[PDB]
Amino acid sequence: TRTAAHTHIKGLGLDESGVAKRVEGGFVGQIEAREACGVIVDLIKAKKMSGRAILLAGGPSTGKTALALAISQELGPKVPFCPLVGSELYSVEVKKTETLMENFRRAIGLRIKETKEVYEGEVTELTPEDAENPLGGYGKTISHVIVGLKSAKGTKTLRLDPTIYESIQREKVSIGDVIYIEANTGAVKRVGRSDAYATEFDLETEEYVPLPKGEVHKKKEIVQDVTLHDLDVANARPQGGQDVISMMGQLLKPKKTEITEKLRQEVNKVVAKYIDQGVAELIPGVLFIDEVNMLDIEIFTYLNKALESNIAPVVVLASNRGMTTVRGTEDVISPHGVPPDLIDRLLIVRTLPYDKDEIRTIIERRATVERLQVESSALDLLATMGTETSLRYALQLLAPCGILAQTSNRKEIVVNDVNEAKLLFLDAKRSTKI
Amino acid sequence: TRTAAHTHIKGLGLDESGVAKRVEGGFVGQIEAREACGVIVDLIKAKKMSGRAILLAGGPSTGKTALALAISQELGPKVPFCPLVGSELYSVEVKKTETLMENFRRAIGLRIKETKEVYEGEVTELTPEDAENPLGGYGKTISHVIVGLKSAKGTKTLRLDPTIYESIQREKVSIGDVIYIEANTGAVKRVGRSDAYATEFDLETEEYVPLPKGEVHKKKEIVQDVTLHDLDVANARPQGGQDVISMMGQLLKPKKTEITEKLRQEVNKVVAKYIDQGVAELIPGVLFIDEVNMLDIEIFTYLNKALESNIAPVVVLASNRGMTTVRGTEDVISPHGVPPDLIDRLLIVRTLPYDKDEIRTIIERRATVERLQVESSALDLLATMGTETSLRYALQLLAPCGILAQTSNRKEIVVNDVNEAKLLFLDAKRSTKILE
Amino acid sequence: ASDYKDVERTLLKLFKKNNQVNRVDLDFLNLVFTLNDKDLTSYHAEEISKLTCVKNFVEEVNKLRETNKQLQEEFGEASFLNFQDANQYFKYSNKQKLEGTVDMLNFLKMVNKLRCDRRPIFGKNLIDLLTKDRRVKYDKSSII
Amino acid sequence: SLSLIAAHSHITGLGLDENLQPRPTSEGMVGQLQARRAAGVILKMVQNGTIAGRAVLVAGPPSTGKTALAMGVSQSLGKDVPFTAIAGSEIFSLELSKTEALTQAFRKSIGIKIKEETELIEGEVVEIQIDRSGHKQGKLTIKTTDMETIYELGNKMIDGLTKEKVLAGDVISIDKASGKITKLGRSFARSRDYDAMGADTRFVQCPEGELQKRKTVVHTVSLHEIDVINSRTQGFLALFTGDTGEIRSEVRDQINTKVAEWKEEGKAEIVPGVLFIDEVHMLDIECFSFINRALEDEFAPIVMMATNRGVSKTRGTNYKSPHGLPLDLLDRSIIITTKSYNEQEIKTILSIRAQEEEVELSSDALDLLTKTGVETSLRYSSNLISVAQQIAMKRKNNTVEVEDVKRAYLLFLDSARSVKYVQENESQYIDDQGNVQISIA
Amino acid sequence: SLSLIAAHSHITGLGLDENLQPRPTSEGMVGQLQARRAAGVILKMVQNGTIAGRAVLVAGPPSTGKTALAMGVSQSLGKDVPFTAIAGSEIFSLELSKTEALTQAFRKSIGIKIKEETELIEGEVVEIQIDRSIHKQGKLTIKTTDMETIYELGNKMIDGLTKEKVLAGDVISIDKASGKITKLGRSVQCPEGELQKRKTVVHTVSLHEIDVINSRTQGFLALFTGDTGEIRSEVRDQINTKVAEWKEEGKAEIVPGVLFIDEVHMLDIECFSFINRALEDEFAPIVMMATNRGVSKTRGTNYKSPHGLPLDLLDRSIIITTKSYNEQEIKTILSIRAQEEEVELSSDALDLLTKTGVETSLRYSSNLISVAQQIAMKRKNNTVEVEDVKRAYLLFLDSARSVKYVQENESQYIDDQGNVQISIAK
Ligand SMILES: Nc1ncnc2c1ncn2[C@@H]1O[C@H](COP(=O)(O)OP(=O)(O)OP(O)(O)=S)[C@@H](O)[C@H]1O
Ligand SMILES: Nc1ncnc2c1ncn2[C@@H]1O[C@H](COP(=O)(O)OP(=O)(O)O)[C@@H](O)[C@H]1O
Ligand SMILES: Nc1ncnc2c1ncn2[C@@H]1O[C@H](COP(=O)(O)OP(=O)(O)O)[C@@H](O)[C@H]1O
Ligand SMILES: Nc1ncnc2c1ncn2[C@@H]1O[C@H](COP(=O)(O)OP(=O)(O)O)[C@@H](O)[C@H]1O
Ligand SMILES: [Mg+2]
Ligand SMILES: [Mg+2]
Ligand SMILES: [Mg+2]
Ligand SMILES: [Mg+2]
């Protein structure tokens, strides 16, 4: 129901073993940029390279942010995408380099696939079977503990090992309780009483949970997604409890800190171990730094060093500048805002300006997205203004025209509404004249 | 008593009709400025308007601070008046905007009254009682406690909740100790030991205190004047709690924090409710910012927004420079060093320089208030010196003249004493000449 | 700093005498409300505010006051003169006792009104609801 | 709300008709018909709630109704729709980065209406009977004004009752989901039993109606509040202290996902609001570059911006800009302009201000004030009104007249006369070079 | 107070007579007749205490005696009166605003004397008898020079004595009110009279100390740790009003003092703007400011000023000007320095030192005395002769000769442009 500025960008709209369609996925025009973004997306999906930089170079209202969002949508929500504005790097709690590194490691992702066998159901029988003692001594010995669990369309009896008695005592389970016992670990966990005994007492503090469905023996595959930043922060943070370190952590507000290279290397080592064990897979991801012109020279030098890291994501930068001095420098005039050292390490994609027909098609598709109806003459006038002042000016002017039409009890936008909005809301040029 | 620079200023010195006398209230001259300040004082006493601002514009040594302090004296000690200078806003713990806002709410006083009932006296009995049946309660099953307090006018036997008994035990109260119970909150305080048992032991560490006067059960109405900023600070950094975390936080330094607008809104809600109920009354004060030139353009821009609030005191500003570039800006030459947008929200009260007669009268009054006797000839010499260099130079040269006269065992300052003071202590122009 | 403890004790003792006398308990008047979010709930606070017992206090005060009016009608011209009769002194003592209990009820009513008005800005139920870890349980938690 | 008569205290809202046609004077606003139409269109855009992240710039000469228009928009929006009004200089902090301050401002402008369902039993316990050896068993009685029922208590319920130390005459509430017991207070019958009462004790009536009740309650919480609560373990204190720090980006992403899940499940509703930045020209180029991308979000609010500078220098850059703002931000912003008032509009504004300040002006005094306003400034006459009222009251006259306004004009100067006096006596006031002649003779 | 020899150790006072006329050489000060007369006027104003918020500027050329004058004023002012001496570079802190630092400096120089009357028993302990509950029964005996009596203890006194574990035969001190126990060695010393004495103890504190004490739960540690923080202004107002009330009651007296800023030419315009108003209010001490630069640009401003200070502050100050010394005064100052440093100079050695000081600098000749003494000691000679001073001159260079050497060999040093010729060849 909400309508941001890129709700209609569903993807790049390419075809397999082909090129960009003229209009598909909410994109009109920009064939070369869409094809380049497609090959970059293929490279990212290959998941075999690190520190690959592409720069989205073009003027305002040329589709750069739309292209970045299309890359994000094409890769899917599983690949970690980290939108960012260059202004965000300038923190007050830590240095710029630390923030850049944190974003870098936030772009890398990890997927953990674990299969677990579990028996679940209401406890019905609890009987230990006596057996002969190997050491004699006239003592009473147990060789197994028998637990009977009943489920929806299922029930079974288990001859578990004698060790279960400790977990049963610790979890203070009873007959009528529904429990959760791991097949290979031997631990147990009770989630509550069965709903069948909710009537036995009028009041009871414990929560009665519905009887679990299916067979008692269930095999489940749990997938969890984490980022290297998440692991680093979790390892750099106290557990949280009654110990004294957590108490002083409660007293002193947790500020960002320079996470040392030792902790990061430990995280990398454990991740590599579990990846080799076959439980985890690595996803590179994308780090999108919009308005790269805002970055200072120190951040650019650290990008130069960090792009060479053996584990780094694909960095997409966007700049609407021409020959401008690099921030933090007095006489370094470089193409776009990026200093020449970083430009040598990246690949540039151009975003062309639009024609009248492209502007008109964009306007009509946006109007369709906003659930608005426009007359042909009104659409032609809107496109004329878009080519006269700005595309974004008309795209934004769509909504006030709709409001004016609705106030006039009309379900369609007409040239009168367009002119009324034009007089009410001035553009940058007409206001500068005023 | 100590004699500061503005001790002689006792008031604006106006008539009932608003006209300003030539010499009254320690002031000499400045008729128009004094009348304008009197109208402003009436406006403050009206207590109807918020965000009104005036700016005292004039040259150095003209009386801007004198007029501000006269306004403060005329309003009285029951109305807030927070002095400031432009440099004090630049803190290192919080943004300058937060400091300005805290100063704004430090000048909106609130008078809140609360009726409190206290039981005080010397403990004579303490007889805890259990329930009539053991099954009545849990564990100890402690019922009410009976305490007997003694005062100068008699004794009273009180029936207390078991919570008060627990408090009594916590405070370690025995028979004979003078105690203090607040029925408003249930708090028990141990004043000390009665003077009656002072000589029970010849060596004992006990703060012996006399028996309380009046009745044991005295009801008193307590009235306090608190600013809104006091409530904001109380909410931001509450002193409650006896946990380890609470005490550790108490030991920490009280760094200023950006108190959110939500807390201010909630404080305003509760204060409005109490004002409606009649419990509290609002006293808009005055905020005085001397040397407004030192504020940055950001501070002025935030002042534009602050002055439009529903609760804002009467800010009085002083500037002693004209056609000066505003701090934090490269090109904006402004009338008084104050941005034009803020000037449009201001009323400028121009203060004018003095002539020889006014300077002479000022020196006379300053010598009188300093407990110094000055000869007419030396006083004319001082007046000529002051009109030659500055009024403040003479006003500060008065004291060394008195010391020099005393060193010669003279009751009054003679012209020779003033000449010797000139020789010993120079002025700015003469120091510049001698260093050149 | 050990040598400075005596100075600290002297200064604190000097300041406490003025501090204690003319202060208003801001906690009692609900002017401080930042601790209430920790131990109070929104609906419980509003229910207690709705369930206040001011009416019972007012009706009991009026009942005692009309009983006192009847007693004054029976007694006649009340006076505080030195007592020479058991009846007169007993009736005067009853009058003063009834006035005292009326005052006690009034003060208790005001205290109860101020105590039941306490409310939290965010109830602990709201904090728990906004902090709850969605629908995640240990059933699908990753052991790794 | 606790308030005094302020600059914008007379604006109840935009004086718009049903067709968004402004009235010549209504709800405390005069003139600015085109600007008021545009403001009403923006207001309806906000009310519809579908369009997200729109930048509006309010431009015009000083003292022309920009902040007045913003106040009117806020009043028309009313409560239940957030409206965060901040200054340009407020975002500069020693604790938060500029981007973090802008993010918190943006999140404050979006409110979440969350529903929580609670089932409770409330009543005054009449009798409690507990038997204990093995596990304990007991029966309990709770009454209302029109109901009474005896319940049987489990072992854990008995343990909770004992740890709460509940006695007869207590009004308690139990959540049947968790069994937690909260003591509301004591009955009135137990008030006489003591002379002094503890801090915990409270006297409450017996609840009415059915013993077991189902109720849903709606809470209005901003996105920023959810982020602060879910950041630390005691963030709700930072919601008041302001010591929140730079909240983690992952926390904000988690909160966005959680709000989306709630909205899909229908227990949370989004009420977008208006972020108003006063004097946007005090912002930096970094802030504007952040704002450009911030508006391109599904949760982004509608941003109103008020500026008066023309071709001025953007802060943080070495070049001039059409409004003091970079061209990229102006591209994605629709501009609402204001126009200087004529004599009649100034007269009506002064009359409205006089009515708000309960000052009874005369016709000749009103004409003199209007002439001073058109000659010098509107705010100058508006401020002179109250000073003239005080002068007239000092003259033991209940109505203001020409003499009072003349005296107020003489006592209190304006910008022009102050500039004239400072220029005529340049030698006695400190200059840029610092030279000043304190001496007179 | 054991310490080594400084550069101002010889100045034990301002050297004035009853009529405030300074003697040619007294209390370690030589010359500067008018400066010392004015300093005596300032000292009398400080001692009177009836004048507040006066600023005196001590201006003049370097090596003329500004810091020496301040030290003489401080010594003649004596103890029992605050004297805070801070350099202008100490204001700039990362934890305190410059205005807050200046405020704390201002409050540090106003002292408050509080008298506390305590009842304490002092004597030589003899016997202690403590018994179990029959809560506790206890008797202690204290012997003095003329009395020997037993005291019947109570519960808390018994607990305190057990906590201290006082032995027998050792001098002990017990306070009746506070209950503090101060141990002393066995009776060199002995009890001197009555068992229970009535002696008052006076505590000297400053307004800043009271502010910091009330700032936190245990704020008095911050007076040593330095983590005071910007104190709330309401707390300072409370301290001020309570000090006024105490002075009215007569239970505490105020001792105004002197604040000395040695290098005011480093403070910025904000600091001066703050000082202008801080001087006006009551409880403002007397501020002494020392500057040397003739006309310079005030820090934080782009314009020159008559002393590096804004004209507003100079209007509020009276200026004491110091004049350069001549040959005889240099000779006697060097003689005083040599006497302080325990160096026996010869007549010709002293004359050579005087001519060197007149030609180059007084400080340079002052520093050469100790080096000359060490040179002579290497020759196993007691008195410092001319040749020792000549060798000291040859081994150690002054500013002018060093500048001449640098100018004549500008290639081998690093210049402002960052160029140097390290290579000895070419
Ligand atoms: N090829 C395109 N097809 C459809 N819509 C487009 C296309 N290019 C841009 N748009 C839309 O035009 C609007 C502005 O374009 P954006 O790409 O968001 O801005 P931009 O071109 O990156 O310029 P900057 O750098 O942000 S100032 C957005 O609503 C886009 O969705
Ligand atoms: N009208 C007046 N009557 C008497 N004394 C005055 C008057 N105006 C100023 N003074 C004295 O002159 C001195 C300078 O006043 P002040 O207001 O501090 O200077 P400025 O006006 O530059 O701020 C003060 O000590 C004050 O006592
Ligand atoms: N159209 C209007 N109707 C009513 N009052 C107005 C109107 N325009 C301006 N005002 C009043 O004029 C005063 C100036 O405010 P404003 O115009 O917002 O200043 P600025 O635009 O310079 O920020 C305000 O108090 C406002 O109430
Ligand atoms: N009048 C004096 N009497 C005695 N010694 C002096 C005198 N003036 C200066 N000195 C000595 O000269 C040395 C340097 O003086 P100093 O205080 O640094 O002056 P300044 O600060 O103006 O340079 C000090 O060690 C001091 O002992
Ligand atoms: Mg973009
Ligand atoms: Mg002044
Ligand atoms: Mg405005
Ligand atoms: Mg020096």
UniProtKB/Swiss-Prot annotation, chain E:
SMART domains: AAA (SM00382). It is found in: Nucleus, Nucleoplasm. The gene is RVB2. It comes from the Eukaryota. InterPro entries: AAA+_ATPase, P-loop_NTPase, RuvB-like, RuvB-like_C, RuvBL1/2_DNA/RNA_bd_dom, TIP49_P-loop. This is RuvB-like protein 2. Probably forms a homohexamer. Interacts with RVB1 and may form heterododecamers with RVB1. Component of the SWR1 chromatin remodeling complex composed of at least ACT1, ARP4, RVB1, RVB2, ARP6, YAF9, VPS71, VPS72, SWC3, SWC4, SWC5, SWC7 and SWR1, and perhaps BDF1. Component of the chromatin-remodeling INO80 complex, at least composed of ARP4, ARP5, ARP8, RVB1, RVB2, TAF14, NHP10, IES1, IES3, IES4, IES6, ACT1, IES2, IES5 and INO80. Also belongs to the R2TP complex composed of at least RVB1, RVB2, TAH1 and PIH1. Interacts with SPT15/TBP. It catalyses: ATP + H2O = ADP + phosphate + H(+). It is an enzyme of class 3 (hydrolase). One of its GO terms (molecular function) is 5'-3' DNA helicase activity. DNA helicase which participates in several chromatin remodeling complexes, including the SWR1 and the INO80 complexes. The SWR1 complex mediates the ATP-dependent exchange of histone H2A for the H2A variant HZT1 leading to transcriptional regulation of selected genes by chromatin remodeling. The INO80 complex remodels chromatin by shifting nucleosomes. Its ability to induce transcription of some phosphate-responsive genes is modulated by inositol polyphosphates. The INO80 complex is involved in DNA repair by associating to 'Ser-129' phosphorylated H2A histones as a response to DNA damage. Present with 3030 molecules/cell in log phase SD medium. SUPFAM superfamilies: P-loop containing nucleoside triphosphate hydrolases (SSF52540). Belongs to the RuvB family. GO terms for cellular component: chromatin; Ino80 complex; NuA4 histone acetyltransferase complex; nucleus; R2TP complex; Swr1 complex; TTT Hsp90 cochaperone complex. GO terms for biological process: box C/D snoRNP assembly; chromatin remodeling; DNA repair; protein stabilization; regulation of DNA-templated transcription; regulation of transcription by RNA polymerase II; rRNA processing. Keywords: Activator, ATP-binding, Chromatin regulator, DNA damage, DNA repair, Helicase, Hydrolase, Nucleotide-binding, Nucleus, rRNA processing, Transcription, Transcription regulation. Its EC number is 3.6.4.12. ATP binds at residues 60-67. It holds the Pfam family TIP49_C.
